[PDB]
């Protein structure tokens, strides 16, 4: 019967639940912004070499998962920002060396996909083939968890323009 | 010979009771009797006659061999359980050991976020009891709301005082 509650949810007019998660963090609060701070830092996700306004509501994911302190001395910025967030917001700038590379997904004229990775700051262009391409520069390695896309053609508009739905998803190593 | 009930009814297409109750034959039969249903030809109801008959006993009907149980019946019953528009927070193995049925009920528990009370064959000694968990196929992170039971002992019947063996799944349910 429809009274059963599913795990995967979409757009249909119904209410259900998402699968349980236990490896997650959360923190509530409203930034007072009496004093404002900013600085450089290295973080998971986030557009590097660009000022980013982060508050108590969004820093949890926009700053990404705090990095392991054993990995060099990169726990300094994450510790500092977590300390500072309980009082106000920040305008952090993320800096990465040339070793940082973002993925790029090229799409041919008939829709065939191709994978690549390029260092940040470098701009990619389209050759004679490979009709278009997409890329993420959000700073996420997309490896843990990984990021996937789904494409499904749908009905056209009044003008008859061919349309398709795109669905973004995040998949963990566990399988969530 | 013990009587159970008696009901008067009129063959009329528009038959009514003195209290206004519907005396239409199949309609009255379904309204009063919870044991007998009838089918009446619309082209022969007008010409149908009645008679005084005694000792009218059904013959030729029987359930057959109930020992033989089919996975098709199992899955049909599972479908009935799903489509049942009533709340139920717990399900039982209830003497069912078919692997396909167990898997189906496990999927039902998973997709309805309910509790399952599966049981395994009591005759399985601990040597083969351990692989039976894997043989279930419900091992995993999804089928965690359910439980699996075993009873490696013999008891005495309450009714026929016989050396019998049956699972403790219902007893555990009653206890919790």
GROMACS .gro file of N, CA and C in nm, chain A:
model
  528
    1UNK      N    1   0.083  -0.120   0.000
    1UNK     CA    2   0.000   0.000   0.000
    1UNK      C    3   0.087   0.125   0.000
    2UNK      N    4   0.028   0.238  -0.039
    2UNK     CA    5   0.102   0.363  -0.043
    2UNK      C    6   0.145   0.409   0.095
    3UNK      N    7   0.090   0.349   0.200
    3UNK     CA    8   0.124   0.388   0.336
    3UNK      C    9   0.268   0.354   0.371
    4UNK      N   10   0.331   0.267   0.293
    4UNK     CA   11   0.473   0.242   0.310
    4UNK      C   12   0.553   0.368   0.279
    5UNK      N   13   0.665   0.383   0.348
    5UNK     CA   14   0.750   0.501   0.334
    5UNK      C   15   0.879   0.459   0.265
    6UNK      N   16   0.907   0.522   0.151
    6UNK     CA   17   1.026   0.492   0.073
    6UNK      C   18   1.145   0.573   0.123
    7UNK      N   19   1.262   0.540   0.071
    7UNK     CA   20   1.386   0.610   0.105
    7UNK      C   21   1.427   0.713   0.001
    8UNK      N   22   1.412   0.682  -0.127
    8UNK     CA   23   1.445   0.775  -0.234
    8UNK      C   24   1.325   0.864  -0.261
    9UNK      N   25   1.347   0.995  -0.260
    9UNK     CA   26   1.240   1.092  -0.275
    9UNK      C   27   1.262   1.177  -0.399
   10UNK      N   28   1.152   1.220  -0.459
   10UNK     CA   29   1.159   1.303  -0.578
   10UNK      C   30   1.073   1.427  -0.571
   11UNK      N   31   0.986   1.443  -0.671
   11UNK     CA   32   0.903   1.561  -0.686
   11UNK      C   33   0.756   1.531  -0.661
   12UNK      N   34   0.718   1.404  -0.652
   12UNK     CA   35   0.579   1.367  -0.634
   12UNK      C   36   0.524   1.424  -0.504
   13UNK      N   37   0.393   1.449  -0.504
   13UNK     CA   38   0.324   1.511  -0.390
   13UNK      C   39   0.306   1.406  -0.280
   14UNK      N   40   0.413   1.385  -0.205
   14UNK     CA   41   0.411   1.290  -0.095
   14UNK      C   42   0.519   1.324   0.006
   15UNK      N   43   0.508   1.263   0.123
   15UNK     CA   44   0.605   1.281   0.231
   15UNK      C   45   0.661   1.145   0.270
   16UNK      N   46   0.794   1.135   0.272
   16UNK     CA   47   0.862   1.013   0.312
   16UNK      C   48   0.990   1.051   0.384
   17UNK      N   49   1.080   0.955   0.401
   17UNK     CA   50   1.202   0.975   0.478
   17UNK      C   51   1.322   0.937   0.393
   18UNK      N   52   1.436   0.993   0.427
   18UNK     CA   53   1.563   0.957   0.367
   18UNK      C   54   1.632   0.850   0.449
   19UNK      N   55   1.723   0.774   0.389
   19UNK     CA   56   1.795   0.670   0.464
   19UNK      C   57   1.874   0.729   0.579
   20UNK      N   58   1.889   0.648   0.685
   20UNK     CA   59   1.958   0.694   0.805
   20UNK      C   60   2.104   0.725   0.774
   21UNK      N   61   2.154   0.831   0.837
   21UNK     CA   62   2.296   0.864   0.838
   21UNK      C   63   2.342   0.882   0.981
   22UNK      N   64   2.464   0.836   1.009
   22UNK     CA   65   2.523   0.852   1.141
   22UNK      C   66   2.654   0.928   1.139
   23UNK      N   67   2.723   0.935   1.025
   23UNK     CA   68   2.850   1.004   1.016
   23UNK      C   69   2.827   1.144   0.959
   24UNK      N   70   2.763   1.227   1.041
   24UNK     CA   71   2.732   1.364   1.003
   24UNK      C   72   2.741   1.453   1.126
   25UNK      N   73   2.761   1.582   1.102
   25UNK     CA   74   2.772   1.681   1.207
   25UNK      C   75   2.676   1.795   1.179
   26UNK      N   76   2.641   1.868   1.285
   26UNK     CA   77   2.549   1.980   1.272
   26UNK      C   78   2.573   2.078   1.386
   27UNK      N   79   2.544   2.205   1.359
   27UNK     CA   80   2.562   2.310   1.458
   27UNK      C   81   2.469   2.425   1.423
   28UNK      N   82   2.389   2.467   1.521
   28UNK     CA   83   2.291   2.572   1.501
   28UNK      C   84   2.339   2.703   1.562
   29UNK      N   85   2.290   2.813   1.508
   29UNK     CA   86   2.325   2.944   1.558
   29UNK      C   87   2.304   3.050   1.453
   30UNK      N   88   2.293   3.174   1.501
   30UNK     CA   89   2.274   3.291   1.416
   30UNK      C   90   2.392   3.384   1.435
   31UNK      N   91   2.461   3.416   1.325
   31UNK     CA   92   2.579   3.501   1.333
   31UNK      C   93   2.540   3.643   1.373
   32UNK      N   94   2.610   3.698   1.472
   32UNK     CA   95   2.581   3.833   1.517
   32UNK      C   96   2.646   3.938   1.427
   33UNK      N   97   2.764   3.908   1.374
   33UNK     CA   98   2.832   3.995   1.278
   33UNK      C   99   2.860   4.133   1.335
   34UNK      N  100   2.879   4.140   1.467
   34UNK     CA  101   2.926   4.264   1.527
   34UNK      C  102   3.064   4.300   1.475
   35UNK      N  103   3.152   4.200   1.463
   35UNK     CA  104   3.283   4.216   1.403
   35UNK      C  105   3.299   4.109   1.296
   36UNK      N  106   3.360   4.147   1.184
   36UNK     CA  107   3.376   4.057   1.071
   36UNK      C  108   3.523   4.030   1.044
   37UNK      N  109   3.552   3.906   1.011
   37UNK     CA  110   3.686   3.857   0.990
   37UNK      C  111   3.696   3.784   0.857
   38UNK      N  112   3.818   3.773   0.807
   38UNK     CA  113   3.846   3.699   0.685
   38UNK      C  114   3.992   3.658   0.686
   39UNK      N  115   4.026   3.566   0.596
   39UNK     CA  116   4.164   3.522   0.584
   39UNK      C  117   4.176   3.410   0.484
   40UNK      N  118   4.299   3.362   0.471
   40UNK     CA  119   4.331   3.254   0.379
   40UNK      C  120   4.311   3.121   0.450
   41UNK      N  121   4.288   3.016   0.373
   41UNK     CA  122   4.276   2.884   0.432
   41UNK      C  123   4.267   2.778   0.325
   42UNK      N  124   4.288   2.654   0.368
   42UNK     CA  125   4.273   2.537   0.282
   42UNK      C  126   4.161   2.452   0.339
   43UNK      N  127   4.064   2.419   0.255
   43UNK     CA  128   3.948   2.346   0.302
   43UNK      C  129   3.898   2.255   0.191
   44UNK      N  130   3.828   2.150   0.231
   44UNK     CA  131   3.756   2.069   0.135
   44UNK      C  132   3.643   2.151   0.076
   45UNK      N  133   3.618   2.132  -0.054
   45UNK     CA  134   3.516   2.209  -0.124
   45UNK      C  135   3.549   2.358  -0.122
   46UNK      N  136   3.458   2.440  -0.171
   46UNK     CA  137   3.479   2.583  -0.173
   46UNK      C  138   3.563   2.627  -0.291
   47UNK      N  139   3.523   2.735  -0.355
   47UNK     CA  140   3.598   2.785  -0.470
   47UNK      C  141   3.729   2.846  -0.422
   48UNK      N  142   3.843   2.795  -0.466
   48UNK     CA  143   3.971   2.851  -0.421
   48UNK      C  144   3.999   2.986  -0.486
   49UNK      N  145   4.087   3.062  -0.420
   49UNK     CA  146   4.129   3.192  -0.470
   49UNK      C  147   4.010   3.283  -0.497
   50UNK      N  148   3.913   3.279  -0.406
   50UNK     CA  149   3.794   3.362  -0.417
   50UNK      C  150   3.736   3.383  -0.278
   51UNK      N  151   3.703   3.508  -0.246
   51UNK     CA  152   3.639   3.536  -0.118
   51UNK      C  153   3.506   3.464  -0.112
   52UNK      N  154   3.477   3.406   0.004
   52UNK     CA  155   3.356   3.328   0.023
   52UNK      C  156   3.299   3.364   0.160
   53UNK      N  157   3.176   3.415   0.160
   53UNK     CA  158   3.106   3.450   0.283
   53UNK      C  159   3.043   3.325   0.342
   54UNK      N  160   3.089   3.286   0.461
   54UNK     CA  161   3.045   3.164   0.527
   54UNK      C  162   2.992   3.201   0.665
   55UNK      N  163   2.876   3.146   0.699
   55UNK     CA  164   2.811   3.173   0.826
   55UNK      C  165   2.800   3.044   0.906
   56UNK      N  166   2.734   3.055   1.022
   56UNK     CA  167   2.714   2.938   1.108
   56UNK      C  168   2.622   2.836   1.043
   57UNK      N  169   2.533   2.879   0.954
   57UNK     CA  170   2.437   2.787   0.895
   57UNK      C  171   2.499   2.698   0.789
   58UNK      N  172   2.594   2.751   0.712
   58UNK     CA  173   2.641   2.685   0.591
   58UNK      C  174   2.784   2.636   0.598
   59UNK      N  175   2.862   2.684   0.695
   59UNK     CA  176   3.003   2.649   0.698
   59UNK      C  177   3.025   2.499   0.708
   60UNK      N  178   2.926   2.426   0.761
   60UNK     CA  179   2.944   2.283   0.787
   60UNK      C  180   2.980   2.208   0.660
   61UNK      N  181   2.910   2.237   0.551
   61UNK     CA  182   2.937   2.173   0.423
   61UNK      C  183   3.017   2.260   0.328
   62UNK      N  184   2.994   2.392   0.329
   62UNK     CA  185   3.070   2.476   0.237
   62UNK      C  186   3.218   2.473   0.272
   63UNK      N  187   3.252   2.457   0.400
   63UNK     CA  188   3.390   2.432   0.438
   63UNK      C  189   3.427   2.285   0.425
   64UNK      N  190   3.330   2.197   0.405
   64UNK     CA  191   3.359   2.056   0.387
   64UNK      C  192   3.398   1.988   0.517
   65UNK      N  193   3.436   1.862   0.503
   65UNK     CA  194   3.478   1.784   0.618
   65UNK      C  195   3.612   1.834   0.669
   66UNK      N  196   3.624   1.867   0.797
   66UNK     CA  197   3.755   1.906   0.852
   66UNK      C  198   3.861   1.800   0.826
   67UNK      N  199   3.980   1.846   0.788
   67UNK     CA  200   4.086   1.757   0.746
   67UNK      C  201   4.156   1.693   0.866
   68UNK      N  202   4.220   1.580   0.840
   68UNK     CA  203   4.292   1.508   0.944
   68UNK      C  204   4.413   1.589   0.989
   69UNK      N  205   4.429   1.614   1.119
   69UNK     CA  206   4.545   1.691   1.165
   69UNK      C  207   4.677   1.624   1.133
   70UNK      N  208   4.681   1.491   1.130
   70UNK     CA  209   4.805   1.421   1.100
   70UNK      C  210   4.856   1.456   0.961
   71UNK      N  211   4.766   1.492   0.870
   71UNK     CA  212   4.805   1.532   0.736
   71UNK      C  213   4.872   1.669   0.740
   72UNK      N  214   5.003   1.671   0.763
   72UNK     CA  215   5.072   1.799   0.770
   72UNK      C  216   5.022   1.881   0.886
   73UNK      N  217   5.014   2.012   0.864
   73UNK     CA  218   4.966   2.107   0.964
   73UNK      C  219   4.842   2.180   0.915
   74UNK      N  220   4.755   2.108   0.845
   74UNK     CA  221   4.640   2.168   0.781
   74UNK      C  222   4.517   2.171   0.872
   75UNK      N  223   4.529   2.125   0.996
   75UNK     CA  224   4.420   2.137   1.092
   75UNK      C  225   4.412   2.276   1.153
   76UNK      N  226   4.517   2.357   1.138
   76UNK     CA  227   4.516   2.493   1.191
   76UNK      C  228   4.398   2.574   1.140
   77UNK      N  229   4.375   2.586   1.009
   77UNK     CA  230   4.266   2.673   0.964
   77UNK      C  231   4.130   2.620   1.003
   78UNK      N  232   4.109   2.488   0.994
   78UNK     CA  233   3.978   2.432   1.027
   78UNK      C  234   3.948   2.453   1.174
   79UNK      N  235   4.047   2.430   1.261
   79UNK     CA  236   4.027   2.455   1.403
   79UNK      C  237   3.994   2.601   1.427
   80UNK      N  238   4.069   2.691   1.363
   80UNK     CA  239   4.048   2.833   1.387
   80UNK      C  240   3.909   2.877   1.342
   81UNK      N  241   3.865   2.831   1.225
   81UNK     CA  242   3.736   2.875   1.175
   81UNK      C  243   3.624   2.816   1.259
   82UNK      N  244   3.639   2.691   1.303
   82UNK     CA  245   3.537   2.634   1.390
   82UNK      C  246   3.528   2.713   1.520
   83UNK      N  247   3.643   2.758   1.571
   83UNK     CA  248   3.642   2.842   1.690
   83UNK      C  249   3.572   2.974   1.664
   84UNK      N  250   3.600   3.036   1.549
   84UNK     CA  251   3.548   3.170   1.523
   84UNK      C  252   3.401   3.170   1.484
   85UNK      N  253   3.348   3.058   1.436
   85UNK     CA  254   3.212   3.058   1.386
   85UNK      C  255   3.109   3.077   1.496
   86UNK      N  256   3.141   3.038   1.620
   86UNK     CA  257   3.042   3.049   1.726
   86UNK      C  258   3.015   3.193   1.766
   87UNK      N  259   3.069   3.289   1.693
   87UNK     CA  260   3.055   3.429   1.729
   87UNK      C  261   3.011   3.515   1.612
   88UNK      N  262   3.062   3.489   1.492
   88UNK     CA  263   3.028   3.569   1.375
   88UNK      C  264   3.060   3.488   1.250
   89UNK      N  265   3.043   3.552   1.135
   89UNK     CA  266   3.068   3.491   1.006
   89UNK      C  267   3.206   3.533   0.955
   90UNK      N  268   3.247   3.475   0.842
   90UNK     CA  269   3.377   3.502   0.785
   90UNK      C  270   3.371   3.513   0.635
   91UNK      N  271   3.480   3.565   0.578
   91UNK     CA  272   3.492   3.593   0.435
   91UNK      C  273   3.615   3.522   0.381
   92UNK      N  274   3.620   3.392   0.407
   92UNK     CA  275   3.743   3.315   0.390
   92UNK      C  276   3.782   3.308   0.243
   93UNK      N  277   3.912   3.306   0.217
   93UNK     CA  278   3.966   3.283   0.084
   93UNK      C  279   4.045   3.153   0.087
   94UNK      N  280   4.014   3.063  -0.005
   94UNK     CA  281   4.079   2.933  -0.011
   94UNK      C  282   4.193   2.936  -0.112
   95UNK      N  283   4.309   2.884  -0.071
   95UNK     CA  284   4.428   2.881  -0.155
   95UNK      C  285   4.475   2.737  -0.170
   96UNK      N  286   4.505   2.697  -0.293
   96UNK     CA  287   4.554   2.562  -0.320
   96UNK      C  288   4.675   2.573  -0.411
   97UNK      N  289   4.771   2.481  -0.401
   97UNK     CA  290   4.886   2.482  -0.492
   97UNK      C  291   4.845   2.433  -0.630
   98UNK      N  292   4.944   2.428  -0.720
   98UNK     CA  293   4.920   2.383  -0.856
   98UNK      C  294   4.878   2.237  -0.863
   99UNK      N  295   4.909   2.159  -0.759
   99UNK     CA  296   4.873   2.018  -0.757
   99UNK      C  297   4.723   1.996  -0.758
  100UNK      N  298   4.645   2.096  -0.716
  100UNK     CA  299   4.500   2.082  -0.715
  100UNK      C  300   4.447   2.078  -0.857
  101UNK      N  301   4.363   1.978  -0.885
  101UNK     CA  302   4.304   1.958  -1.016
  101UNK      C  303   4.155   1.931  -1.001
  102UNK      N  304   4.076   1.989  -1.090
  102UNK     CA  305   3.933   1.969  -1.093
  102UNK      C  306   3.893   1.882  -1.212
  103UNK      N  307   3.786   1.805  -1.199
  103UNK     CA  308   3.741   1.721  -1.310
  103UNK      C  309   3.659   1.799  -1.412
  104UNK      N  310   3.662   1.750  -1.535
  104UNK     CA  311   3.590   1.807  -1.648
  104UNK      C  312   3.526   1.693  -1.726
  105UNK      N  313   3.400   1.711  -1.764
  105UNK     CA  314   3.325   1.608  -1.835
  105UNK      C  315   3.285   1.666  -1.969
  106UNK      N  316   3.340   1.610  -2.076
  106UNK     CA  317   3.314   1.657  -2.211
  106UNK      C  318   3.204   1.575  -2.275
  107UNK      N  319   3.122   1.639  -2.358
  107UNK     CA  320   3.007   1.577  -2.420
  107UNK      C  321   3.013   1.601  -2.570
  108UNK      N  322   3.013   1.493  -2.647
  108UNK     CA  323   3.024   1.502  -2.791
  108UNK      C  324   2.893   1.551  -2.851
  109UNK      N  325   2.892   1.562  -2.984
  109UNK     CA  326   2.775   1.613  -3.054
  109UNK      C  327   2.656   1.521  -3.037
  110UNK      N  328   2.680   1.390  -3.027
  110UNK     CA  329   2.574   1.293  -3.005
  110UNK      C  330   2.561   1.251  -2.860
  111UNK      N  331   2.635   1.315  -2.769
  111UNK     CA  332   2.616   1.293  -2.627
  111UNK      C  333   2.714   1.198  -2.561
  112UNK      N  334   2.815   1.151  -2.633
  112UNK     CA  335   2.912   1.061  -2.572
  112UNK      C  336   2.995   1.136  -2.468
  113UNK      N  337   3.018   1.077  -2.351
  113UNK     CA  338   3.093   1.146  -2.246
  113UNK      C  339   3.242   1.112  -2.248
  114UNK      N  340   3.320   1.202  -2.189
  114UNK     CA  341   3.463   1.183  -2.173
  114UNK      C  342   3.507   1.251  -2.045
  115UNK      N  343   3.607   1.193  -1.979
  115UNK     CA  344   3.656   1.243  -1.851
  115UNK      C  345   3.791   1.311  -1.868
  116UNK      N  346   3.817   1.410  -1.783
  116UNK     CA  347   3.948   1.473  -1.777
  116UNK      C  348   3.964   1.540  -1.641
  117UNK      N  349   4.086   1.581  -1.613
  117UNK     CA  350   4.115   1.663  -1.496
  117UNK      C  351   4.217   1.768  -1.535
  118UNK      N  352   4.197   1.890  -1.486
  118UNK     CA  353   4.287   1.999  -1.519
  118UNK      C  354   4.315   2.082  -1.395
  119UNK      N  355   4.434   2.140  -1.384
  119UNK     CA  356   4.466   2.222  -1.267
  119UNK      C  357   4.383   2.349  -1.265
  120UNK      N  358   4.360   2.399  -1.144
  120UNK     CA  359   4.280   2.519  -1.127
  120UNK      C  360   4.352   2.640  -1.186
  121UNK      N  361   4.273   2.739  -1.226
  121UNK     CA  362   4.324   2.855  -1.294
  121UNK      C  363   4.334   2.838  -1.444
  122UNK      N  364   4.361   2.717  -1.490
  122UNK     CA  365   4.367   2.689  -1.632
  122UNK      C  366   4.227   2.681  -1.691
  123UNK      N  367   4.210   2.737  -1.810
  123UNK     CA  368   4.082   2.738  -1.879
  123UNK      C  369   4.083   2.639  -1.995
  124UNK      N  370   3.975   2.562  -2.007
  124UNK     CA  371   3.962   2.461  -2.110
  124UNK      C  372   3.876   2.516  -2.223
  125UNK      N  373   3.905   2.470  -2.345
  125UNK     CA  374   3.832   2.510  -2.464
  125UNK      C  375   3.780   2.387  -2.536
  126UNK      N  376   3.695   2.410  -2.635
  126UNK     CA  377   3.630   2.304  -2.711
  126UNK      C  378   3.694   2.293  -2.849
  127UNK      N  379   3.730   2.172  -2.888
  127UNK     CA  380   3.789   2.146  -3.019
  127UNK      C  381   3.678   2.139  -3.124
  128UNK      N  382   3.712   2.090  -3.243
  128UNK     CA  383   3.614   2.079  -3.350
  128UNK      C  384   3.500   1.985  -3.310
  129UNK      N  385   3.534   1.871  -3.250
  129UNK     CA  386   3.435   1.780  -3.196
  129UNK      C  387   3.400   1.818  -3.054
  130UNK      N  388   3.338   1.722  -2.983
  130UNK     CA  389   3.309   1.736  -2.841
  130UNK      C  390   3.224   1.862  -2.816
  131UNK      N  391   3.101   1.855  -2.866
  131UNK     CA  392   3.009   1.968  -2.876
  131UNK      C  393   3.015   2.064  -2.759
  132UNK      N  394   3.018   2.013  -2.636
  132UNK     CA  395   3.028   2.101  -2.520
  132UNK      C  396   3.094   2.025  -2.406
  133UNK      N  397   3.096   2.089  -2.289
  133UNK     CA  398   3.154   2.026  -2.171
  133UNK      C  399   3.105   2.097  -2.047
  134UNK      N  400   3.123   2.031  -1.933
  134UNK     CA  401   3.088   2.084  -1.802
  134UNK      C  402   3.205   2.057  -1.708
  135UNK      N  403   3.206   2.129  -1.596
  135UNK     CA  404   3.312   2.111  -1.498
  135UNK      C  405   3.266   2.169  -1.365
  136UNK      N  406   3.323   2.116  -1.258
  136UNK     CA  407   3.302   2.167  -1.123
  136UNK      C  408   3.433   2.228  -1.075
  137UNK      N  409   3.425   2.350  -1.022
  137UNK     CA  410   3.539   2.417  -0.962
  137UNK      C  411   3.515   2.448  -0.815
  138UNK      N  412   3.420   2.377  -0.753
  138UNK     CA  413   3.384   2.399  -0.614
  138UNK      C  414   3.490   2.352  -0.516
  139UNK      N  415   3.601   2.296  -0.563
  139UNK     CA  416   3.706   2.250  -0.475
  139UNK      C  417   3.686   2.111  -0.418
  140UNK      N  418   3.574   2.047  -0.448
  140UNK     CA  419   3.550   1.912  -0.399
  140UNK      C  420   3.622   1.810  -0.485
  141UNK      N  421   3.703   1.721  -0.427
  141UNK     CA  422   3.767   1.616  -0.507
  141UNK      C  423   3.670   1.520  -0.572
  142UNK      N  424   3.546   1.511  -0.522
  142UNK     CA  425   3.443   1.423  -0.579
  142UNK      C  426   3.489   1.277  -0.578
  143UNK      N  427   3.564   1.239  -0.475
  143UNK     CA  428   3.618   1.105  -0.466
  143UNK      C  429   3.566   1.038  -0.340
  144UNK      N  430   3.531   1.118  -0.241
  144UNK     CA  431   3.490   1.066  -0.112
  144UNK      C  432   3.411   1.171  -0.036
  145UNK      N  433   3.279   1.178  -0.056
  145UNK     CA  434   3.199   1.096  -0.147
  145UNK      C  435   3.214   1.141  -0.291
  146UNK      N  436   3.164   1.063  -0.386
  146UNK     CA  437   3.173   1.096  -0.527
  146UNK      C  438   3.043   1.161  -0.574
  147UNK      N  439   3.053   1.235  -0.684
  147UNK     CA  440   2.942   1.311  -0.738
  147UNK      C  441   2.906   1.258  -0.876
  148UNK      N  442   2.778   1.227  -0.896
  148UNK     CA  443   2.731   1.168  -1.020
  148UNK      C  444   2.616   1.250  -1.077
  149UNK      N  445   2.595   1.234  -1.207
  149UNK     CA  446   2.486   1.301  -1.277
  149UNK      C  447   2.406   1.198  -1.355
  150UNK      N  448   2.276   1.225  -1.367
  150UNK     CA  449   2.186   1.141  -1.445
  150UNK      C  450   2.111   1.229  -1.544
  151UNK      N  451   2.103   1.184  -1.669
  151UNK     CA  452   2.037   1.258  -1.776
  151UNK      C  453   1.923   1.174  -1.831
  152UNK      N  454   1.806   1.235  -1.843
  152UNK     CA  455   1.690   1.167  -1.900
  152UNK      C  456   1.609   1.265  -1.983
  153UNK      N  457   1.598   1.238  -2.113
  153UNK     CA  458   1.520   1.325  -2.200
  153UNK      C  459   1.373   1.321  -2.160
  154UNK      N  460   1.306   1.435  -2.175
  154UNK     CA  461   1.166   1.449  -2.137
  154UNK      C  462   1.093   1.522  -2.249
  155UNK      N  463   0.969   1.562  -2.222
  155UNK     CA  464   0.888   1.626  -2.323
  155UNK      C  465   0.940   1.766  -2.355
  156UNK      N  466   0.904   1.815  -2.473
  156UNK     CA  467   0.946   1.946  -2.519
  156UNK      C  468   0.850   2.054  -2.467
  157UNK      N  469   0.884   2.178  -2.497
  157UNK     CA  470   0.801   2.292  -2.459
  157UNK      C  471   0.703   2.322  -2.571
  158UNK      N  472   0.632   2.435  -2.559
  158UNK     CA  473   0.540   2.476  -2.665
  158UNK      C  474   0.614   2.501  -2.795
  159UNK      N  475   0.733   2.561  -2.787
  159UNK     CA  476   0.815   2.580  -2.906
  159UNK      C  477   0.868   2.448  -2.961
  160UNK      N  478   0.853   2.339  -2.887
  160UNK     CA  479   0.905   2.211  -2.931
  160UNK      C  480   1.052   2.190  -2.902
  161UNK      N  481   1.112   2.274  -2.818
  161UNK     CA  482   1.254   2.263  -2.790
  161UNK      C  483   1.281   2.135  -2.711
  162UNK      N  484   1.375   2.054  -2.760
  162UNK     CA  485   1.409   1.930  -2.692
  162UNK      C  486   1.460   1.959  -2.552
  163UNK      N  487   1.408   1.885  -2.455
  163UNK     CA  488   1.441   1.907  -2.315
  163UNK      C  489   1.480   1.776  -2.250
  164UNK      N  490   1.566   1.785  -2.150
  164UNK     CA  491   1.601   1.670  -2.069
  164UNK      C  492   1.619   1.715  -1.925
  165UNK      N  493   1.588   1.624  -1.834
  165UNK     CA  494   1.611   1.646  -1.692
  165UNK      C  495   1.750   1.597  -1.654
  166UNK      N  496   1.815   1.675  -1.569
  166UNK     CA  497   1.943   1.640  -1.510
  166UNK      C  498   1.926   1.628  -1.359
  167UNK      N  499   1.984   1.523  -1.303
  167UNK     CA  500   1.972   1.493  -1.161
  167UNK      C  501   2.111   1.476  -1.102
  168UNK      N  502   2.144   1.561  -1.006
  168UNK     CA  503   2.273   1.555  -0.938
  168UNK      C  504   2.261   1.468  -0.814
  169UNK      N  505   2.363   1.386  -0.788
  169UNK     CA  506   2.359   1.300  -0.672
  169UNK      C  507   2.497   1.285  -0.611
  170UNK      N  508   2.498   1.260  -0.481
  170UNK     CA  509   2.619   1.236  -0.404
  170UNK      C  510   2.614   1.093  -0.351
  171UNK      N  511   2.717   1.015  -0.380
  171UNK     CA  512   2.722   0.875  -0.340
  171UNK      C  513   2.844   0.852  -0.252
  172UNK      N  514   2.821   0.792  -0.136
  172UNK     CA  515   2.927   0.762  -0.042
  172UNK      C  516   2.989   0.625  -0.071
  173UNK      N  517   3.107   0.602  -0.014
  173UNK     CA  518   3.173   0.473  -0.031
  173UNK      C  519   3.093   0.361   0.032
  174UNK      N  520   3.024   0.389   0.143
  174UNK     CA  521   2.941   0.288   0.206
  174UNK      C  522   2.828   0.244   0.113
  175UNK      N  523   2.771   0.338   0.039
  175UNK     CA  524   2.665   0.306  -0.054
  175UNK      C  525   2.546   0.398  -0.039
  176UNK      N  526   2.553   0.488   0.059
  176UNK     CA  527   2.446   0.584   0.079
  176UNK      C  528   2.447   0.683  -0.036
   0.00000   0.00000   0.00000
